[PDB]
Symmetry: D2
Subunit: 122 residues, 4 copies
């Protein structure tokens, strides 16, 4: 599972998720969004179930990106929540919440939701 | 903001979120849920906008917990996405996605959503 | 439950949700948002569990508003999903998804999520 | 758009969404889930932007189903929020919130979130 997660993945938008799974449940790496207020790589940190149910279930996981790096600050952060499923078409299936830093009038409209599917090719 | 975030926070359910904000946008610490399939502390990792808009906006952030530690494994992970707002009633306002590792029949029913409000007291 | 739901409710933002619960599980009425691209009343339609579990559980429900009326069109619709809980502090607790009509480039950023609490006073 | 919406649609799970779009922004029809605690048809009610932006944008919409009919009561309701996009591969792209009627201890775990893609074939 650690073997399976670690690597470079791509989502349907052409974004690039580069991750290492530590044996202790850690996720570390970089993210590059093909869309939005973003350019180049951004740090990411997250967690996964390092002793997943052996009954052929997926492995639960999450990570976060703060959309600040040396090129831009989009005053925002995305968390993806989902599962890794192994096999020859390996997948990370996620849903995500993007919160954007705001004042307390438009804070009702503070958070976007979506879904990303990450694969090992394309 | 780093000064303001670092500390112990409590949500409306009586859960305990202990966090350190690194100067580089890192969030590290522990989480203890008062509810669900959980006991004691669990590792957490996340990210925040370390150069937030000075126009009195909140600071965007996220973190993840994999619900595995030495006592239990709930085959699941929660990501909270939201903002920190300073002042004398400081708040972290979040929304969250809990994904539970599953087989590919009930995977439509894989993810819970909610909201947590974290304060410095109670 | 039909007795309890029907009426005028207010959310934390000062919005006004006026609803009739039909005996057949129907919800009909009007909504007026205190925020966003909106003014005056808008039609709403929805559904509730008209034979709720008698074990003191809440009653599940949803409704939709298309943000078009004779004054404005915000090219968008909100659905609230949640439960009605009776008693002397009666509550409808919801989460909501607002989708905004878009082209297929920004469609990743198409849907906002939030939560509203509706009460019988204020 | 009214012409385009009205009809029978299918989602990736094999569910059947039968809808009529009234000229006044109404959505009425039936839903049959291929999954979960459900069988046969259930009433649905919803709303759409009946004067959508002509700039080739999608048309915003929502609907609700209370999972009660003459065969079962699943003490729950789903709202789908999303957009209709016309053309020869017409699509309704949605996200959904399923709330399940509960007591006030597990109410933190009250709402599932997902996404459905509806097409005119299969
Ligand atoms: Ir297990
Ligand atoms: Ir999915
Ligand atoms: Ir999709
Ligand atoms: Ir700024
Ligand atoms: Ir909020
Ligand atoms: Ir709340
Ligand atoms: Ir029942
Ligand atoms: Ir709630
Ligand atoms: Ir709240
Ligand atoms: Ir327009
Ligand atoms: Ir989508
Ligand atoms: Ir999908």
């Amino acid at each position: 599972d650690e073997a399976g997660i670690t690597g470079t993945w791509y989502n349907q938008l052409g974004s690039t998720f580069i991750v290492t799974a530590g044996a202790d449940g850690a996720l570390t790496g970089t993210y590059e969004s093909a869309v939005g207020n973003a350019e180049s790589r951004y740090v990411l940190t997250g967690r996964y179930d390092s002793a997943p149910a052996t009954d052929g279930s997926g492995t639960a996981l999450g990570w976060t990106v703060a959309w600040k790096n040396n090129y831009r600050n989009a005053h925002s952060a995305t968390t993806w929540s989902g599962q890794y499923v192994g096999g020859a078409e390996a997948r990370i299936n996620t849903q995500w919440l993007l919160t954007a830093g705001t004042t307390e009038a438009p804070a009702w409209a503070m958070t976007l939701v979506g879904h990303d599917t990450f694969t090992k090719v394309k």
